[PDB]
Amino acid sequence: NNISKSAIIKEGVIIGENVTIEDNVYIDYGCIIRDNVHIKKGSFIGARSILGEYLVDFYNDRINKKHPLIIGENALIRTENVIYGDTIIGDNFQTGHKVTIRENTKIGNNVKIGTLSDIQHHVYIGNYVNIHSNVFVGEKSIIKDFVWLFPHVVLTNDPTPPSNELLGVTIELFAVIAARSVVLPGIHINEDALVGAGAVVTKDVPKETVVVGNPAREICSIRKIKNKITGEQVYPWRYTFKRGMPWEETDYDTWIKNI
Amino acid sequence: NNISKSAIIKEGVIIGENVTIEDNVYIDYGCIIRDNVHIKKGSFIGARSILGEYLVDFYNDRINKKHPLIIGENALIRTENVIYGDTIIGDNFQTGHKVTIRENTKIGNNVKIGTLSDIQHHVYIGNYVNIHSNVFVGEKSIIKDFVWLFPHVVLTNDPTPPSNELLGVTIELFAVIAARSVVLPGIHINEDALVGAGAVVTKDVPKETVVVGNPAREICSIRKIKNKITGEQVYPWRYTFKRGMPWEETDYDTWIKNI
Amino acid sequence: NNISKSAIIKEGVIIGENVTIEDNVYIDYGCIIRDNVHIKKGSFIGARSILGEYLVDFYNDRINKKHPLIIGENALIRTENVIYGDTIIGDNFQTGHKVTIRENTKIGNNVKIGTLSDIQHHVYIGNYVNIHSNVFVGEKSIIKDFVWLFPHVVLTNDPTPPSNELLGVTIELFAVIAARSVVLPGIHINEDALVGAGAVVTKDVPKETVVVGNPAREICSIRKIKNKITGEQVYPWRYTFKRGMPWEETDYDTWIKNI
Ligand SMILES: CC(C)(COP(=O)(O)OP(=O)(O)OC[C@H]1O[C@@H](n2cnc3c(N)ncnc32)[C@H](O)[C@@H]1OP(=O)(O)O)[C@@H](O)C(=O)NCCC(=O)NCCS
Ligand SMILES: CC(C)(COP(=O)(O)OP(=O)(O)OC[C@H]1O[C@@H](n2cnc3c(N)ncnc32)[C@H](O)[C@@H]1OP(=O)(O)O)[C@@H](O)C(=O)NCCC(=O)NCCS
Ligand SMILES: CC(C)(COP(=O)(O)OP(=O)(O)OC[C@H]1O[C@@H](n2cnc3c(N)ncnc32)[C@H](O)[C@@H]1OP(=O)(O)O)[C@@H](O)C(=O)NCCC(=O)NCCS
Numbered sequence: 001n002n003i004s005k006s007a008i009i010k011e012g013v014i015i016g017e018n019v020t021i022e023d024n025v026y027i028d029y030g031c032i033i034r035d036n037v038h039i040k041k042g043s044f045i046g047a048r049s050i051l052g053e054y055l056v057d058f059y060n061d062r063i064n065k066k067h068p069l070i071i072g073e074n075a076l077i078r079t080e081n082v083i084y085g086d087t088i089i090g091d092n093f094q095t096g097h098k099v100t101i102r103e104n105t106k107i108g109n110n111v112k113i114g115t116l117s118d119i120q121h122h123v124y125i126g127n128y129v130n131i132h133s134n135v136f137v138g139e140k141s142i143i144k145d146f147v148w149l150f151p152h153v154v155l156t157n158d159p160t161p162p163s164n165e166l167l168g169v170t171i172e173l174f175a176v177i178a179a180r181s182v183v184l185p186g187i188h189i190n191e192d193a194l195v196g197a198g199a200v201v202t203k204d205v206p207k208e209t210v211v212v213g214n215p216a217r218e219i220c221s222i223r224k225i226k227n228k229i230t231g232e233q234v235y236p237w238r239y240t241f242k243r244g245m246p247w248e249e250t251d252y253d254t255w256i257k258n259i
Numbered sequence: 260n261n262i263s264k265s266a267i268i269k270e271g272v273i274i275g276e277n278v279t280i281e282d283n284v285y286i287d288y289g290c291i292i293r294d295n296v297h298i299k300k301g302s303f304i305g306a307r308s309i310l311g312e313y314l315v316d317f318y319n320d321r322i323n324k325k326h327p328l329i330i331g332e333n334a335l336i337r338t339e340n341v342i343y344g345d346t347i348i349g350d351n352f353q354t355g356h357k358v359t360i361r362e363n364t365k366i367g368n369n370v371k372i373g374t375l376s377d378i379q380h381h382v383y384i385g386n387y388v389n390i391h392s393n394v395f396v397g398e399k400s401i402i403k404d405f406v407w408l409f410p411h412v413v414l415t416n417d418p419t420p421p422s423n424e425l426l427g428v429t430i431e432l433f434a435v436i437a438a439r440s441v442v443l444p445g446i447h448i449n450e451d452a453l454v455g456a457g458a459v460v461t462k463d464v465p466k467e468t469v470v471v472g473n474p475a476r477e478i479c480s481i482r483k484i485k486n487k488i489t490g491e492q493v494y495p496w497r498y499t500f501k502r503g504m505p506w507e508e509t510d511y512d513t514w515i516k517n518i
Numbered sequence: 519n520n521i522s523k524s525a526i527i528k529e530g531v532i533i534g535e536n537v538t539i540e541d542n543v544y545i546d547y548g549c550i551i552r553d554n555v556h557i558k559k560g561s562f563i564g565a566r567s568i569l570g571e572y573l574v575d576f577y578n579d580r581i582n583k584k585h586p587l588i589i590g591e592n593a594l595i596r597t598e599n600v601i602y603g604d605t606i607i608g609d610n611f612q613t614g615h616k617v618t619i620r621e622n623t624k625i626g627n628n629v630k631i632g633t634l635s636d637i638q639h640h641v642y643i644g645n646y647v648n649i650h651s652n653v654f655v656g657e658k659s660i661i662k663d664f665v666w667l668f669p670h671v672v673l674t675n676d677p678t679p680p681s682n683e684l685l686g687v688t689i690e691l692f693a694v695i696a697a698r699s700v701v702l703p704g705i706h707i708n709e710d711a712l713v714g715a716g717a718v719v720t721k722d723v724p725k726e727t728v729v730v731g732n733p734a735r736e737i738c739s740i741r742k743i744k745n746k747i748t749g750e751q752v753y754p755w756r757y758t759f760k761r762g763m764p765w766e767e768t769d770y771d772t773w774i775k776n777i
């Protein structure tokens with residue numbers, strides 16, 4: 001192991017082998033840090049979380065194989081998060097409570113995953129992605145930058161279950177999936193699209209389009225939407241909302257010029 | 260601190276500062292009692308729960324600020340509940356497992372919150388409220404006395420997400436929201452209304468009215484409903500159901516005369 | 519107690535009385551094994567799980583009554599599962615994380631229950647049943663062999679809530695309930711039926727029938743369904759899918775001849 005003198009490791013913490021904990025990481029009461037886990041500088045790991053959780057192969061003979069987990073700098077991981085090995089999480093990651101993240105998954109920077117969320121294996125999550133409470137993200141899902149998944153959203157992948165050939169969902173830049181929506185396997189949700197709350201999305205959703213219902217149906221251009229309090233046009237949301245975004249201190253247009 | 264000699268504190272328990280535990284409180288294995296938490300007499304706190312959980316400001320510099328949490332008398336809090344500071348919970352509170360309750364929230368007396376439920380910040384819950392399994396209660400929601408939220412209900416608050424101006428839902432006295440229903444932001448569910456299972460509630464629901472569907476539509480007066488086993492009129496439910504209610508030992512009419 | 523010399527009991531484990539742990543059982547960090555729990559040979563019990571969790575009667579006077587829990591051979595129980603007393607689980611059981619299983623419940627062999635699932639009391643689950651992530655199974659539900667419940671499915675039981683007379687759902691052999699579906703009380707889902715994702719099932723679903731929508735409506739024979747990748751007829755699924763099934767090494771027809 002390699003643990004920094006500035007790291008704060010509370011009691012009850014259990015540490016395995018081939019563990020690297022950088023500078024100013026704080027590991028709260030009772031976490032279990034299994035083998036092959038690397039936590040980058042400045043991170044906070046919440047009470048009782050279990051990092052580098054066992055992949056299936058461990059159970060064959062109870063011998064833990066090597067499946068490195070890396071968590072980027074300055075994470076703010078809340079209590080009891082369970083994160084599998086063979087996964088990579090970028091910088092400035094934040095979570096709510098009791099989140100579960102599987103193996104062979106990649107999560108970008110400045111991503112937020114809320115309480116109870118369940119990220120399966122072989123998932124791709126980009127940067128500045130916001131996944132709220134109890135969202136189910138099935139294997140093979142691809143979530144592009146700036147997408148928002150509201151509470152209780154479920155992204156599926158078996159088109160005619162149970163079957164052998166899975167098709168993951170792809171959610172393109174800035175699309176928002178409102179709460180309690182379920183997306184069917186292999187569907188493409190296009191850029192700046194809006195899936196209304198509770199929808200059952202059975203077909204691809206075209207860019208800048210709003211769909212609602214079971215089955216979801218297109219009701220209009222996202223541009224038609226007016227803020228309910230101020231009467232202003234809302235979407236694309238990048239010009240009306242910037243809390244926690246990279247253009248927070250400027251404006252989208254200037255920011256995107258620079259990138 | 261101030262801990263009663265009659266309190267039973269199991270092992271693994273971790274206690275912070277400015278903690279007050281009254282008489283005959285029982286704190287099960289491994290709970291973490293962070294600073295500024297007051298647990299009233301007779302309460303049971305389940306294994307591994309974490310009380311007075313850190314608000315966001317702690318993370319600025321890892322210095323825990325003062326945000327008192329008070330839990331009323333005779334709570335029956337199950338395992339692994341996470342409850343934030345700056346919140347008040349009344350007497351005879353009961354929970355299921357792994358419930359999460361945020362800050363700046365107020366919960367009345369004789370309230371029940373089930374397994375996995377997630378109560379966000381700035382929520383108001385009255386008395387004799389029953390929230391069943393895995394209900395998501397968003398910030399600014401106002402839940403009046405005697406309301407029932409069935410498993411997987413989700414109360415939302417961002418009308419055109421992501422946006423800055425939130426509108427909480429208000430659920431009036433005795434209304435029942437059946438399972439897997441989602442309520443849109445700022446909706447008013449009126450007294451004795453019934454939201455049928457799985458509904459997507461997009462408009463206010465008038466008193467004593469039953470709505471179903473996606474989007475929910477009024478189908479009839481709640482009074483039209485017959486018990487499926489006995490054929491008797493069901494609603495208002497206060498005259499047909501009294502298990503755990505304050506008129507349990509009498510009758511509604513006599514009881515309400517007295518209050 | 520009766521604990522095998524071959525059992526591996528990690529630290530932090532807490533064991534009560536009248537506990538029997540067979541040969542080659544492995545109990546991971548911090549589990550709490552309350553009284554009257556019998557874990558059969560070869561089982562793995564994940565970190566921080568709590569087995570033989572207290573029934574309601576304990577709380578009367580904080581005296582734990584006798585409600586035996588038995589877990590069959592070779593379980594693979596993941597972290598933080600909470601399992602009540604007065605319940606029986608068969609052999610080769612596997613779970614995801616943070617699953618909750620209530621009392622007076624019976625679970626067969628080769629059953630899988632995923633992350634966050636919540637099994638209430640007085641539930642019946644047969645063999646080779648697959649319950650995926652965050653499924654809510656209400657009391658009195660009867661789930662027959664080979665049934666699949668996809669993420670976020672919810673089986674209800676109070677027909678006109680809150681009421682006193684509950685009616686459990688019955689899911690017959692091999693039926694599949696797709697994700698985010700809710701089934702109303704007392705409904706019968708017949709053999710080899712398919713409930714499409716997100717459905718609101720308000721009426722019995724006839725054998726080999728596919729229903730979709732809110733409220734769910736019959737759209738066709740399950741036999742009409744073609745695999746989306748291969749174009750082949752999918753159902754009954756027993757002839758097209760066999761991963762983890764008892765006819766995995768043979769074929770259904772030969773297998774069922776033998777049983
Ligand atoms: C997409 C959305 C913004 C559109 O709502 P809207 O602007 O209020 O649409 P309208 O109020 O103009 O209603 C338009 C019509 O579509 C219906 N409708 C609106 N949203 C619907 C939905 N999610 N599902 C089904 N029907 C819907 C309305 O009932 C109305 O139908 P009607 O007048 O014929 O009876 C809204 O459905 C939504 O999803 N809000 C997000 C809630 C959320 O999840 N926030 C994040 C979590 S806090
Ligand atoms: C509101 C409720 C009681 C009405 O159910 P109901 O009395 O069976 O209504 P009916 O059986 O008379 O059916 C009336 C019509 O409305 C439809 N309907 C009933 N409930 C519906 C629902 N929740 N969503 C959509 N449609 C619904 C029925 O299919 C029928 O339609 P149809 O005959 O044209 O095909 C029921 O929907 C419900 O919510 N039960 C609560 C289940 C629950 O969540 N319990 C608590 C958790 S245990
Ligand atoms: C039942 C199911 C297989 C049928 O999907 P399907 O074969 O794609 O049906 P189709 O694509 O031929 O679409 C048929 C029609 O029914 C509609 N439809 C399909 N599934 C629907 C659903 N779940 N709810 C409502 N409508 C649905 C389609 O939109 C189309 O309507 P339209 O053409 O008039 O606009 C699918 O709904 C489903 O449930 N897949 C399972 C997803 C899942 O939960 N997997 C397990 C978790 S990974």
Ligand SMILES: Cc1cn([C@H]2C[C@H](O)[C@@H](COP(=O)(O)OP(=O)(O)O[C@H]3O[C@H](C)[C@H](O)[C@H](N)[C@H]3O)O2)c(=O)[nH]c1=O
Nearest residue numbers: 095096097113114115130132133314315416417421422
């Ligand atoms: C900040 C914080 C978050 N969380 C969890 C709760 C949620 O599951 C997840 C995100 O919570 P958050 O307060 O950061 O919420 P936000 O992601 O900021 O979402 C808000 O803004 C959105 C645009 C929408 O308007 C939404 N309705 C609002 O809640 O993280 C905690 O558990 N504790 C915390 O202290």
Ligand SMILES: Cc1cn([C@H]2C[C@H](O)[C@@H](COP(=O)(O)OP(=O)(O)O[C@H]3O[C@H](C)[C@H](O)[C@H](N)[C@H]3O)O2)c(=O)[nH]c1=O
Nearest residue numbers: 354355356372373374389391392573574675676680681
């Ligand atoms: C009593 C008890 C409750 N709980 C959790 C389970 C649920 O999430 C929540 C409420 O469970 P509960 O048994 O007290 O159920 P109730 O609130 O009594 O709801 C029942 O009555 C309602 C009218 C409806 O008919 C409903 N379908 C029934 O389950 O608390 C436990 O985890 N363990 C327990 O021992």
Ligand SMILES: Cc1cn([C@H]2C[C@H](O)[C@@H](COP(=O)(O)OP(=O)(O)O[C@H]3O[C@H](C)[C@H](O)[C@H](N)[C@H]3O)O2)c(=O)[nH]c1=O
Nearest residue numbers: 055056157158162163613614615631632633648650651
């Ligand atoms: C194997 C495994 C499962 N689990 C949990 C995750 C789920 O909640 C539950 C089942 O996960 P699983 O990988 O065994 O999935 P399966 O039950 O194999 O389901 C797959 O195959 C089905 C036919 C459908 O195509 C489905 N979309 C696929 O995911 O157990 C873990 O937490 N860790 C694990 O390592």
